[PDB]
């Protein structure tokens, strides 16, 4: 909060 | 552990906020500049200054768009999240 | 009142700092901290890491500045990678 303005190895199955 | 971790719930939220805005107009799997604008203005109102100039959203979308299709897909949105998160972190060390 | 998106970003930072702070360089994840992060905090998205070779490969993939460890920017690329893969199955 300043702020920054702008301009700047295996997956499971899982149900 | 067996509970969904904060990391894993963080990730889910990234997916959810994307689809909640990408689903609004046109392609439901991509953010056109209008959707991206709303996302940033409504969900990053503490980290990013509000966008009201069209030129800004054009420039942000230009930097974000690497498939060159004029819209932000999820992979490209993650890159954007990475960038923003990294910036806030740089002011935290 | 921070948004869900903003809270998610902060939690990404908080978990990196929790694990990176345990051993050695307190601002980077070494291989052992990385294996623990994945096994402890990603057990529903990634298969458990049981073998050294797997940690080696992951760190090798993640380590783009060549120092053998994973800094925060390299961690975000990891999170982008994983989240994007999961995004498919949803
Ligand atoms: Ca859309
Ligand atoms: Ca695109
Ligand atoms: Ca460390
Ligand atoms: Ca590195």
With contact defined as beta carbons under 8 Å apart, do C86 and C45 qualify? yes
Range of the domain at B4: 1-93
CA nearest A9 in C: which residue? C58
Long-range contacts, B84-90 (Cβ 8 Å, 24+): B84/A4, B84/B44, B84/B47, B84/B48, B84/C9, B85/C9, B85/C12, B85/C13, B85/C76, B86/C72, B86/C73, B86/C76, B87/A4, B87/A8, B87/B47, B88/A4, B88/B47, B88/C9, B88/C10, B88/C13, B89/C13, B89/C72
Contact A9 C45 (CB under 8 A): no
Residue C65: both structure tokens together: 């500045």
Which chains share 3+ C-beta pairs under 8 angstroms with A?
B, C
Smallest Cα–Cα separation from C79: which of C33, C36, C46? C46
Tell me the longest C-alpha to C-alpha distance in chain A.
41
**Does C46 reach chain B within 8 Å, measured CB to CB?**
no
In chain C, which ranges are continuous DSSP H helix?
A: 4-20, 31-41, 52-62, 72-88
Smallest Cα–Cα separation from B73: which of B31, B11, B15, B21? B31
Residue C28: both structure tokens together: 């980077």
Residue B17: both structure tokens together: 């906020």
Which residues are within 8 A (CB) of A4 and not within 5 positions of it... i.e. 6 or more apart?
A: B47, B48, B84, B87, B88, B91
Q: Give C22 Cα–ligand 3 centroid separation in angstroms.
A: 6
Residue with tokens 């402890």: C40
d(CA C58, CA B30): 29
Q: What is the CATH number of the domain that holds C64?
A: 1.10.238.10
Smallest Cα–Cα separation from B60: which of B44, B37, B89? B37
d(CA B14, CA C33): 24
With contact defined as beta carbons under 8 Å apart, do C80 and B15 qualify? no
What b/e sequence results for C27-51 when a residue is b if at least 16 CB atoms lie within 10 Å of its CB, and e otherwise?
ebbbbebbbbbbeebbbbbbeebee
**Does A3 reach chain C within 8 Å, measured CB to CB?**
no
Residue C24: both structure tokens together: 């050695």
Q: How many domains is chain C partitioned into structurally?
A: 1
- Does the annotation list C1 as a binding residue? no
Cis peptide before B52 (omega within 30 of 0): no
Which residues are within 8 A (CB) of B86 and not within 5 positions of it... i.e. 6 or more apart?
A: C72, C73, C76
Provide the 8-state DSSP code for C29.
B
Question: Of B30, B38, B82, which to mutate for an interface test with C (greatest number of C Cβ within 10 Å)?
Answer: B82
Resolved by: X-ray
CA distances C23 to B18, C31, C56, Å, are 35, 10, 17
- Does the annotation list B30 as a binding residue? yes
**Does A6 reach chain B within 8 Å, measured CB to CB?**
yes
State the first-to-last Cα distance of chain A, in angstroms, to the nearest integer.
37
Residue C44: both structure tokens together: 């529903």
Which residues are within 8 A (CB) of B24 and not within 5 positions of it... i.e. 6 or more apart?
A: B34, B35, B38
**Does A2 reach chain B within 8 Å, measured CB to CB?**
yes
């Amino acid at each position: 909060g300043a702020m920054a303005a702008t301009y700047s190895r295996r997956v499971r199955k899982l149900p | 552990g067996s509970h969904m971790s904060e990391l894993e719930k963080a990730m889910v939220a990234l997916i959810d906020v994307f689809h909640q805005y990408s689903g609004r107009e046109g392609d439901k799997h991509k953010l056109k500049k209008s959707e991206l604008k709303e996302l940033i203005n409504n969900e990053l109102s503490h980290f990013l200054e509000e966008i009201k100039e069209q030129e800004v959203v054009d420039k942000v979308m230009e930097t974000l768009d690497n498939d060159g299709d004029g819209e932000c897909d999820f992979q490209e949105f993650m890159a954007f999240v990475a960038m923003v998160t990294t910036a806030c972190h740089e002011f935290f060390e």
